[PDB]
Amino acid sequence: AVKKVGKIIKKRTKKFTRFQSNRFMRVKPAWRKPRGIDCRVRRRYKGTNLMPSIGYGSNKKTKFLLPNNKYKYVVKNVKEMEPLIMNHTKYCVQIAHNVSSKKRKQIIERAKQMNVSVINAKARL
Amino acid sequence: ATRFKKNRKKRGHVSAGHGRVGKHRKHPGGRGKAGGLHHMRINFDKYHPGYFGKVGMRHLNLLKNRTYCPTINVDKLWGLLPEEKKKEFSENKDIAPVIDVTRKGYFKVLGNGKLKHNQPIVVKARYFSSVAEKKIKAVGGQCILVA
Amino acid sequence: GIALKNVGRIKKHGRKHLVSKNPYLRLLVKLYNFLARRTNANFNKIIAKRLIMPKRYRPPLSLSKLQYHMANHPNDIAVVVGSITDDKRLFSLKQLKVCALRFTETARKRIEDAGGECLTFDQLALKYPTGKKCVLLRGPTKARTAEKHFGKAPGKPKSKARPYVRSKGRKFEKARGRRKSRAYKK
Amino acid sequence: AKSKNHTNHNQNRKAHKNGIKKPKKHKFMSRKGLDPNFFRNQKYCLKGIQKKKKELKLKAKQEKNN
Amino acid sequence: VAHNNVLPNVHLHKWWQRHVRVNFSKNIKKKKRRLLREKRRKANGGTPIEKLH
RNA sequence: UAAAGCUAAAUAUAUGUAGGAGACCGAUAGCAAACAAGUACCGUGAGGGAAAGAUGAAAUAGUACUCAGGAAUGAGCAAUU
RNA sequence: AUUUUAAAAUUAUUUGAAUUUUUCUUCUUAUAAUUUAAGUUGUUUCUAUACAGUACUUUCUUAACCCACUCGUCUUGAAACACGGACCAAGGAGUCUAGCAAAUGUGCAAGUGUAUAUGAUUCUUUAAACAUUUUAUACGCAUAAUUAAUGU
RNA sequence: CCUAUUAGCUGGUUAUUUUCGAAAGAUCUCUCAGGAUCGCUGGAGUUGAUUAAUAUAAUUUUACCAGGUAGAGAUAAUGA
RNA sequence: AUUUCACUCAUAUUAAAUAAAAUAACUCCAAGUGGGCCAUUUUUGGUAAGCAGAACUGGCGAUGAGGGAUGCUCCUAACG
RNA sequence: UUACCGAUACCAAGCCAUAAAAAGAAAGAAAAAAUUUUUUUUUAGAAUCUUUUUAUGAGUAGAAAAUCGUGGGGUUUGUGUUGAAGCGAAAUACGUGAGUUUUCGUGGAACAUCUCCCUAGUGCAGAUCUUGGUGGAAGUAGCAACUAUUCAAAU
Ligand SMILES: [Mg+2]
Ligand SMILES: [Mg+2]
Ligand SMILES: [Mg+2]
Ligand SMILES: [Mg+2]
Ligand SMILES: [Mg+2]
Ligand SMILES: [Mg+2]
Ligand SMILES: [Mg+2]
Ligand SMILES: [Mg+2]
Ligand SMILES: [Mg+2]
Ligand SMILES: [Mg+2]
Ligand SMILES: [Mg+2]
Ligand SMILES: [Mg+2]
Ligand SMILES: [Mg+2]
Ligand SMILES: [Mg+2]
Ligand SMILES: [Mg+2]
Ligand SMILES: [Mg+2]
Ligand SMILES: [Mg+2]
Ligand SMILES: [Mg+2]
Ligand SMILES: [Mg+2]
Ligand SMILES: [Mg+2]
Ligand SMILES: [Mg+2]
Ligand SMILES: [Mg+2]
Ligand SMILES: [Mg+2]
Ligand SMILES: [Mg+2]
Ligand SMILES: [Mg+2]
Ligand SMILES: [Mg+2]
Ligand SMILES: [Mg+2]
Ligand SMILES: [Mg+2]
Ligand SMILES: [Mg+2]
Ligand SMILES: [Mg+2]
Ligand SMILES: [Mg+2]
Ligand SMILES: [Mg+2]
Ligand SMILES: [Mg+2]
Ligand SMILES: [Mg+2]
């Protein structure tokens, strides 16, 4: 159903799973549009899988915000996070997956001095 | 570039754009120009009407260098001269230019257009037409035959 | 439901944007869109539209026809959204003022030797904001050879269309269907 | 096996998809094969009229520019 | 055939693949030719390698 | 100016041998064959014809000793890295 | 950051006329305020004097109530007593060349395209790039059509 | 080996969202399980309208025209 | 006939009504189709048929939702 | 004759996309908390762009645009023994969607580029598809010609 926390509204939370992916294991769950005569999902029979459509789209004013109510930016070194000193209230940072611990300590320490929040500041400790 | 080809848009569709009921088969109407005059007749008649049959005399060993002949009209005849040179002749009145068109690659002078009034000009060539030669004479010029 | 045609949606048919990636042409389009919007003059609208058309609808115009069109408009400015070419069939050229998109070297030289001048569209936008004493002209849009193949098919009665043939001669498509002597003409 | 051999079912729905088109309403038509001995005389009349008009216009031009 | 197109003419009905020739070394060969006719000049020892026509 | 004769260069090279290189393939791919490959194997014969790469820096470190068991093998307080 | 303005309504003092003769009677004929104009504002309590708890967010598992025939294909018509499919991993199908046209982008324009070659103080790359023979007739397409044809 | 001979005939033909949207009539064909051509559809482009107008209309009204089906007749023609 | 000059013929209520009438008109390049079937009314062959063959319109096909217990074509009504 | 129940159709309101429309290329201070000075938030101007308004949304064969991912190339600017690619289980995560991104574990040497471009042997559920591996059947069918075996001892 509809989920609403603050001013952010999500029209649906469940995923769209591929038709017949629960019955055959060679069929992966990622959504593919059904083509083919006599399908019962392409023809919108009641009681089966639903199709995704543009109607479920999100409000333009709140489209990429996290529950933090900020946008996400991914950084790879200390210098890449220079632009965040001017807009430190609309953005939060996340550290890339393949940076070492030594680099991560420096990134976290600078992010604290800039008053910007870090999403995942507990990895590799 | 294969990046931009149409077939990539049909890549998840069954029939690749050719149809469920009528397939894509191999030569379902003949090969090349096969069925003309039998079952391709309408196309042949409305797009290439005079196609069938023969007309005219034979010429057994042609040798095209015997009749080669490029032409020029009298319009482009004052334009072979530089503009500053064209200016000088229109000013002075007791001199006229003598132009040899064979040195420029033309063989026959042809008679379309209008020469300037009262501006004599002398033209050398291999062949002339009647109207061209009349127009050259009218403004006070002269034609000369060369070989 | 409801009984509309095209689900109530209005339809348009022409070209909507530039295709060309030339930066100077994009600057010109921006400038003349602004002029057309803020001074709706029916002169800037037509110009702003014409410099978006494809190549086949911006034909060249020669010097002789340029002079002939301006014969009764002395001390006026002619505006063309194509190119000007030279004409060796003219003997003499007058003094003219012309604005256009491109000039060929010979035409540009001939114009300036007679006391005239050549303008670009950013100069005409600066001196004639609303096109006072300016005359819009265009060249022949249906003189291209491709147009000689269009229309009624060659084979219908009384059609003027050219056919697509390998070459030209007595042996190439002149026998049956082109003379009464072989079963019918055309 | 036999088959159908005629129907014009669905033909005027196709006819009305792009409507019933109409003739063009031009102002002049060609007099190629129509009544002769009458249009040749008309050619002479129009040549005379054009001669008079052009001569008056040319004379006016000649005196105006002097 | 079906449209307003010119009637096809291509002369590919035999085994045409066996003799196709791509020219990958035209500039290499002109370098070689230039070097050979330059070598002849040093062997002449002053006299030219051209003849009067 | 026939019914006799000779002659270098500019041209070609899916063969053999040597050298260099690529917006090429990366062990079901690329030659059939990255390995004792026209080999093992099949057919009276003409002929047909595969599968199969990788411990570690070093084995000039490839598993010493004890207990149980006929052995194979297992376990350890015992052992290389 | 200047139309949530103007106007309209209301309330309390007013400048004048009506009539329906009145504590909602009319006519913005003068100033102030307010909203019924000009799309929701306020007061208390809890979460809580917390740092992850049994509370809140989230993902799985298992019930209920209503509903739900096997996909792909040919066919007027498929859940079919029509055919293919025991399962899983890798591989697997509109491409290349010639020749023509239309559309569109680019350059020059009565012209346009430096062919084969040659030249150079080009030579790892470079099999690329650069150049053109010290009133200027290589060739193609275009600049003129038409006829069996002498031709014009 | 020529040779990956040829098949108007069976089988298959791989990511998403958005927008528009059919034909199963007709002419010719050693043609009837095929093809070419018209019609139906998509995409490009120009000319127009943007002025509660004009062009326009699977609709009415006013004026005029053409018809031999339902019905009727058999004492009017023909045939019963 | 044609051509040139004079005068003049309702408009704002538009030479009768009404109109999400310009979503118009015209060129170019192409796809897929060319086995159909069903219902009311009209209608041919046949004793008749869920038989065979035509006409106008609406549908099924290409289309799901509520109702008819059930049902490709019936009734309401077409889909972010 | 009344009341009532009943759609994805009707009406009022929000949001997504599509189509059309009204405009825009000259820039300046608002609030709250604390005592007449401090502290927070904002102070905008990207033209296929930015504000605002109305109507609309079914689809086989078929057609178009925008977008997502793969092996290589040029350009820019990056990660890695303080652990790369790969793989397993996941997430108060983002997106209508294909998919991006991140955590813990295993692993032991390489891996990107979304700044913009170039290029192709570039995307699988089926073809009695090709090669390899593995099931239920199942501890089941079966281990029946040729007359026949027994007692004690050695190893
Ligand atoms: Mg979601
Ligand atoms: Mg179906
Ligand atoms: Mg489709
Ligand atoms: Mg198929
Ligand atoms: Mg068929
Ligand atoms: Mg709707
Ligand atoms: Mg001899
Ligand atoms: Mg010899
Ligand atoms: Mg090599
Ligand atoms: Mg191999
Ligand atoms: Mg139930
Ligand atoms: Mg049920
Ligand atoms: Mg069908
Ligand atoms: Mg059947
Ligand atoms: Mg089925
Ligand atoms: Mg059955
Ligand atoms: Mg079958
Ligand atoms: Mg089977
Ligand atoms: Mg695969
Ligand atoms: Mg072109
Ligand atoms: Mg074969
Ligand atoms: Mg539609
Ligand atoms: Mg069939
Ligand atoms: Mg009649
Ligand atoms: Mg009767
Ligand atoms: Mg329906
Ligand atoms: Mg019933
Ligand atoms: Mg739709
Ligand atoms: Mg590759
Ligand atoms: Mg990678
Ligand atoms: Mg290592
Ligand atoms: Mg492939
Ligand atoms: Mg598979
Ligand atoms: Mg047993």
Burial class (CB in 10 A: 0-12, 13-18, 19+), C93: buried
The Cα E24–Cα B95 span in angstroms is 61
Q: Which one, of C170, C137, C119, lies nearest residue C68 by Cα?
A: C137
Nearest to B14 among A32, A33, A36 (CB): A36
Phi, psi of C78, deg, nearest 5? -95, 140
Q: Which one, of B87, B90, B80, B137, lies nearest residue B111 by Cα?
A: B137
Interatomic separation, CA of residue C36 and C1' of nucleotide F29, rounded (Å) = 63
Residue B13 to residue A35, Cβ atoms within 8 A:
yes
- Tokens representing A49? 């899988």
**Cβ(C171)–Cβ(B59) under 8 Å?**
no
The Cα C179–Cα B50 span in angstroms is 8
Q: Is the CB of A95 under 7 A from strand J?
A: yes
Chain H bases having any atom below 7 Å from a protein CB:
3, 6-21, 23-37, 39-41, 44-48, 56-58
**Cβ(B80)–Cβ(B99) under 8 Å?**
yes
C83: β partners = C102
**Cβ(C144)–Cβ(C55) under 8 Å?**
no
C153 at interface of E, judged by CB pairs closer than 8 A:
yes
Alpha-carbon distances of E15 from A109, B34, C78, rounded to whole Å: 75, 21, 63
Residue B14 to residue A35, Cβ atoms within 8 A:
yes
The Cα B86–Cα B78 span in angstroms is 8
C77: β partners = C134
The Cα C53–Cα C81 span in angstroms is 10
What count of other Cβ atoms lies within 10 Å of the Cβ of residue C161? 17
The Cα B103–Cα C150 span in angstroms is 41
Q: Which one, of B72, B78, B111, lies nearest residue B96 by Cα?
A: B78
| Type of residue found at D5 | N
C137: β partners = C80
**Cβ(B19)–Cβ(B28) under 8 Å?**
no
Residue A36 to residue B12, Cβ atoms within 8 A:
no
The gap from C-alpha A93 to its chain's centroid, in whole angstroms, comes to 14
Dihedral (C-alpha) B16, B19, B20, B21: value to the nearest 10 degrees?
A: -150
Dihedral over Cα of D45, D50, D56, D59: its sign: negative
Phi, psi of B76, deg, nearest 5? -85, 15
The Cα C109–Cα C103 span in angstroms is 9
Pick from E4, E5, E6, E7 the residue to mutate for testing the C interface (most C CBs within 10 Å). Answer: E4
B38 at interface of E, judged by CB pairs closer than 8 A:
no
Phi, psi of E12, deg, nearest 5? -125, 85
Q: Which one, of C78, C91, C85, lies nearest residue C117 by Cα?
A: C78
**Cβ(C79)–Cβ(C46) under 8 Å?**
no
Helix (H), strand (E) at residue B99: strand B98-100
**Cβ(C83)–Cβ(C101) under 8 Å?**
yes
**Cβ(E41)–Cβ(E49) under 8 Å?**
yes
Pick from A18, A31, A33, A35 the residue to mutate for testing the B interface (most B CBs within 10 Å). Answer: A35
- Within residues 23-82 of protein chain A, the ones with CB less than 7 A from nucleic strand J are 24, 26-28, 30-32, 35-37, 44, 46, 52-61, 63-68, 72, 74, 76-77, 79
| Type of residue found at A81 | M
**Is A touching C (3+ C-beta pairs, cut-off 8 A)?**
no
C131: β partners = none
End-to-end CA distance of chain D: 93
Resolution to 1 decimal place, in Å: 2.5
**Cβ(A77)–Cβ(A103) under 8 Å?**
yes
Dihedral (C-alpha) C172, C178, C180, C183: value to the nearest 10 degrees?
A: 80
Q: Which residues contact C3 (CB under 8 A, 6 or more apart)?
A: none
Q: Which one, of B46, B29, B32, lies nearest residue C173 by Cα?
A: B46
Q: What's the gap in Å between E30 CA and the centre of ligand 9?
A: 27
Residue C176 to residue B50, Cβ atoms within 8 A:
yes
Q: Is the CB of D16 under 7 A from strand H?
A: yes
Q: Which one, of C19, C60, C53, lies nearest residue C144 by Cα?
A: C60
3-state SS record for C153-173: CECECCCCCCCCCCCCCCCCC
Listing from the earlier edge strand, what are the strands of the sheet with C117-119?
C117-119, C97-99, C77-80, C134-137
Pairing of the two strands C178-179 and C184-185? antiparallel
- Tokens representing E28? 């290499």
Radius of gyration of the CA atoms of chain C, in A: 23
Structure-determination approach? cryo-EM
- Tokens representing D10? 């669905």
Residue B53 to residue C175, Cβ atoms within 8 A:
yes
Phi, psi of C156, deg, nearest 5? -80, 155
Residue C176 to residue B51, Cβ atoms within 8 A:
yes
Looking across all nucleic acid strands, the nucleotide with the smallest C1' to CA distance from residue A41 is I64
- Within residues 4-33 of protein chain B, the ones with CB less than 7 A from nucleic strand H are 8-16, 21-29
Residues of B in contact with A32 (CB under 8 A): 12
Q: Which residues of B37-72 are buried (b: 16+ CB within 10 A; e: fewer)?
A: eeebeebbbbbbbbbbeeeeeeeeeeeeeeeeeeeb
Phi, psi of B72, deg, nearest 5? -155, 140
Helix (H), strand (E) at residue B143: strand B142-145
| Type of residue found at C18 | L
What count of other Cβ atoms lies within 10 Å of the Cβ of residue C139? 19
**SS3 state of residue C184:** strand
E5 at interface of C, judged by CB pairs closer than 8 A:
yes
